[PDB]
Amino acid sequence: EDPQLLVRVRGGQLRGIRLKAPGGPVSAFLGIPFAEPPVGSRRFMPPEPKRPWSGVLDATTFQNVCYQYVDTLYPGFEGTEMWNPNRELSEDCLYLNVWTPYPRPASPTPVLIWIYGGGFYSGAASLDVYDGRFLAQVEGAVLVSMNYRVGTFGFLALPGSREAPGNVGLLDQRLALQWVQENIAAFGGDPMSVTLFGESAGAASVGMHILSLPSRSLFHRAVLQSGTPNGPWATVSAGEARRRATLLARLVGCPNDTELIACLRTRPAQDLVDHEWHVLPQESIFRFSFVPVVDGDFLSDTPEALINTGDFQDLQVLVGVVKDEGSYFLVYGVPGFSKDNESLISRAQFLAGVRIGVPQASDLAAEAVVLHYTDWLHPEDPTHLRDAMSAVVGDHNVVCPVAQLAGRLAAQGARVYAYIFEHRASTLTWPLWMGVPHGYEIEFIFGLPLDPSLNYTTEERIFAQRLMKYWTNFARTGDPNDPRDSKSPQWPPYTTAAQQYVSLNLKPLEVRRGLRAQTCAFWNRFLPKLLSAT
Amino acid sequence: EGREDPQLLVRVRGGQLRGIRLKAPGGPVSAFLGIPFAEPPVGSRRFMPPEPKRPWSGVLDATTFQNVCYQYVDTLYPGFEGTEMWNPNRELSEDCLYLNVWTPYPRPASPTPVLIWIYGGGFYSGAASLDVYDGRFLAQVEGAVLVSMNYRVGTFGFLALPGSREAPGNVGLLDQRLALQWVQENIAAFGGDPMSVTLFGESAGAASVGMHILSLPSRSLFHRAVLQSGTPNGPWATVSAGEARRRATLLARLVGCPPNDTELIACLRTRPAQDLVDHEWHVLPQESIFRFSFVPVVDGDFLSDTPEALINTGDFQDLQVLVGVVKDEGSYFLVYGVPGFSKDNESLISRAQFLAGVRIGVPQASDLAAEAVVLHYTDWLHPEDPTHLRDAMSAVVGDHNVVCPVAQLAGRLAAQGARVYAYIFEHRASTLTWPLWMGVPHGYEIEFIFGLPLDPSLNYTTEERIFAQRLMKYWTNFARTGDPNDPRDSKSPQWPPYTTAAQQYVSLNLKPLEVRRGLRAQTCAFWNRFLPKLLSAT
Ligand SMILES: *[C@@H]1O[C@H](CO[C@@H]2O[C@@H](C)[C@@H](O)[C@@H](O)[C@@H]2O)[C@@H](O)[C@H](O)[C@H]1NC(C)=O
Ligand SMILES: *[C@@H]1O[C@H](CO)[C@@H](O)[C@H](O)[C@H]1NC(C)=O
Ligand SMILES: *[C@@H]1O[C@H](CO)[C@@H](O)[C@H](O)[C@H]1NC(C)=O
Ligand SMILES: C[N+](C)(C)CCO
């Protein structure tokens, strides 16, 4: 028995495991229950706190992955399967993971809490890319990650109902956050210094905690990587949530809210997943059936309204995007696009693609999109058209929503830093045309290139170390710059006047101005004017 | 005769003429100025198609410019050459249908290609007698035969009650056409070749040239065309029959001829010319710039359909066309209507003034269309920078009215069989009196093409002299062959034709030709493809 691996939390005693990081050992406490299993009658319901336990709870292995759809696009392909569940699926999945330095820190240490993405329909804290041992060992950080319910189980909502109120997957995250407040000191973490970070739906989740009052007392700083609470995919109205839940119920043979939800609770988990993609209103990409709902409770208003009127004075935020946000999604439903060729497309394929990539757009709005993104010097060039299609999907869904949030957060008193991540992993298995896709910064921030067995370059390992420092410096201070270090160049705050952000690549930081400023004016200013008028 | 210069006596269909020997820097030229080509369109003839000049007895003196057609005279900037170089330089009269011919001296012995100039001035102003349209340099240096005609402007040339007998519309274009017919019949008398006739014009003159291209009866009267900063398509060069009728009827009311068309037109004919000019600007539907009250009308006769329809469906197989724009097409127009703009300061404007400016500069835009314009031309890194806003306002007016219509025209003509050459003119005259912020404004290429810098008394630089000579060669090579390039020379860089595929045009400045691609390709897609679609849906 190693006393560094024994911790008493409020629920009782835990035993962790000593894991090996390249530079030395870390302590890992994996699969710690933070809620009562949301099973049987508790399906679709808010999470309840985990009842205390007797003896020593074995916290040496990852727990089950929340029940979810498993990708089948490219069977056997690492680029897709690296995001697939790596443990058994179960509705009994409300567990979290803590990595700390070995030995346990002597003084209270800044805490980073990771919230995974996956379109609110997928993901797990147990994926290899979310491995916290490197940040723990190298930067001395306490890293936490939780599982939260996804798909119907996390976000199926009959708004106004007692039994399926919506947003329960977000309440799972919140409960994990409350757990950190109550318990992280036992591991040597500082509950007065908690930084949330997440990517994609995880970043939208971070944003929603920023916009929901009861969450704000549970953290101090936030990082949103390639995702925002505002924008076209991260939320639905109560009406649209009801529509989708009612339709799924119909599809599984479930005929008053209470009756409807009681019958949904009788169905095997896979029966629900079998139909979750049949409820979207359009043929589309970058759209997910069961996501956070504007309920007037967790979200008191739309994210748009809340970011416009919010006060964010005592908040620091780091936000950014990858170089090619849209490319990943094109292979999931835009004809002409494949990982197996260069995906050089015709103009016809581009116009059709725009309707799928911007599915809520009217005919006129779609025409505006096509005319904006066409290079009128090379209107039928397939390379241009392929890269424009990617651009449309990335800008609409990530870059411009990020630019919008960044600007409103800064105008309303927040301290904001922004980045574009432009380094394409040497080990990437997707084709070159996809560039730096959605999600492929994460492995560097977590510091996987520091593991020699994974075959990243020396340059990539130095780069990872740099990024780990920006992120942990941000966690410690609310400022990603290295404070003992002179010689930078310094990463300046993002402001509405100057609009400064930095490139994160193998070269030293370069400061740029305006995140797609002209094109984002189109998405964020013009298209809405077109909508309210048509 | 007996005692005079035998080299200045010429007979035309109407009778005998005596010209004048003029001095150009390199030698003498022959000038025949103020040759009448129509019966004076006065009295009962006001608003009516021109009638050919009846023959005269004896020798008509053709040694001085004749009357300028009755028109509005600019008084925005008294004493200022920038404005006054465009003002009438001879008596204003309705008796104004006279043309001018310059030729080498002695006259050419073999048939020489003819250039015919059509002046601009928004269809409300202009004269062939202005110093910047002086044909002597082209005549002397290039051996050109050059012809220019006065044509009626304003109400006199373009007031229309469409469908009526007495004010059918487009009579100023019919004046131009009568002059073209005159050249066909008579220009061989001066050594000119009626089988080689190139039209050229600027602004409204360029629009006019384009309308001769789109009207079949004109097509037999010329072979090639140059359109400088003007097009028959676009937002200002024509009006519908309905809008023409509305403006004519309002004008009539304003001058005490309240409304049957015969009666209305008969009362208009009793009015003093100056009365008509005094109310001319009161009939425009919006507060605007780059809009003119009385312009060509889509009458279903001269113009069988809209210029837009006609350029989309036309066969332009046997046409060569040279077209282009100056660097700063919009700036000139800003000081005549947009609050905040002036020749006497830097015209740094606020964002409020930009938004107001856009409504005046795109006067037919809905609220949604105008916010589309504002959002496109705003620099979102520097949305309130006065220098950017000033320059963006200029760009809006220039692109809307000239640059994008020219791109549209060049594309349609090229797609439908024409040989097209395109330019951007980027040299600012060292003698320009407009301020620096205005750049290279609308109209300030003309003095180079005509060769005024060859006159040492005009104080242009030596480099400007050489530049002028180049331009004269391009224009006259195009007149001769339908190709501005020199057959003898080579690299000396070549001017490739404009094509829809490659979109090539050249920079005209003091440096050797540089080839560029796409005339404001992205922005003109906004004007030429998106806004119309907005319009159709909205
Ligand atoms: C530039 O000028 C515009 C027009 O006003 C004229 O010039 C100014 C300086 C006055 O002295 C006035 O007498 C003239 O009529 C102004 O509208 C504009 O505000 C001026 N721009 C600036 C920034 O000074
Ligand atoms: C790969 O691209 C080709 C053409 O480049 C396209 O037709 C095809 O659908 C793509 N995917 C397949 C079917 O392998
Ligand atoms: C040109 O230059 C001379 C000598 O400086 C000057 O006196 C004359 O008035 C100028 N003329 C013009 C056309 O500006
Ligand atoms: C098609 N799915 C929605 C299942 C995958 C999203 O990328």
Ligand SMILES: C[N+](C)(C)CCO
């Ligand atoms: C958001 N994920 C990283 C889970 C998928 C995109 O690569």
Ligand SMILES: C[N+](C)(C)CCO
């Ligand atoms: C059109 N102008 C500006 C030249 C005169 C208006 O009064």
Ligand SMILES: C[N+](C)(C)CCO
């Ligand atoms: C258009 N004009 C040339 C006639 C006036 C100055 O631009």
